[PDB]
Amino acid sequence: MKASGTLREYKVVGRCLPTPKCRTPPLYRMRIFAPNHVVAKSRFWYFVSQLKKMKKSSGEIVYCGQVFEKSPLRVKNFGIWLRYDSRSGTHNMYREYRDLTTAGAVTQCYRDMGARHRARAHSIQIMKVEEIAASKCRRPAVKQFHDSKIKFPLPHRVLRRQHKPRFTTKRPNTFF
């Protein structure tokens, strides 16, 4: 799946056409994280065709709009239940993240899983994302950020843009 840039939220609702037998189909809501509304509605039809008896030709889409985060400044510790497909067999995992925005956390999740286990996101589902309290976190790399009294230097300061000067006399010290 093309993870082009950051993710965008789309509150997608849809149903089937009004039948002469029943009055109305049961409406459902899905919060799809997708690059745009076209693939958001495509994944909506994907999950609806997997779950219920509904086809895209005999159906309709009621609303597909973006809503923003009500608290962007507050930090939230998300926990994502990963449903993926391996090269040999299929397995599931669970991994936490620490980021402000849900779109940023989901954006970091694709790069992290593609770095660890080569996540090809064409057949990878996200079944549940929920915020977690600080005491209930499992990962030590997440729990190590929870430190009010912290005081530490940086180990190394690598410098960039070395082709633009291209010449120097003294040796630059990276200790800053």
Partner: protein, 137 residues
């Protein structure tokens, strides 16, 4: 031997980026390579990596859960701008900016003044040379 520690609530000078040439305080450390305010030049709260920053040795005690109001109050109470003006590096940043935006007529006048200063060198340093030769021989 490390003098400047990365501490929560430390004034840092932004080297480059959108807020080029501005001071910022480390509010929160959320990610491993992403920091998280400048009320003097009205810096909006956003994320920033550790590459485009140059930290200084100035801190004060304040909780990180406070919003922009108490950060602005602590900034105006601590008065970082006077210490930044007393800092020797900011006094030569403007000197480098004047040397960049130096007028060619002003450059010609400074060139003639340095020519006279080099003739003062050619007299006075030669007098120190003959004085050192009198001290040696």
């Amino acid at each position: 031997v490390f003098r400047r520690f990365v501490e929560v609530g430390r004034v840092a000078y932004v080297s480059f980026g959108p807020h080029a040439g501005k001071l910022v305080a480390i509010v929160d450390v959320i990610d491993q390579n992403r920091a998280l305010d400048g009320p003097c030049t009205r810096v909006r709260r956003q994320a920033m990596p550790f590459k485009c920053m140059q930290l200084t040795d100035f801190i004060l005690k304040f909780p990180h859960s406070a919003r922009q109001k108490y950060v602005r109050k602590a900034w105006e109470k601590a008065d970082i701008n006077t210490k930044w003006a007393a800092t020797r590096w900011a006094k030569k940043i403007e000197a480098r900016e004047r040397k960049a935006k130096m007028t060619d007529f002003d450059r010609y006048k400074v060139m003639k003044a340095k020519k006279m200063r080099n003739r003062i060198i050619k007299n006075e340093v030669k007098k120190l040379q003959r004085a050192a030769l009198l001290k040696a021989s």
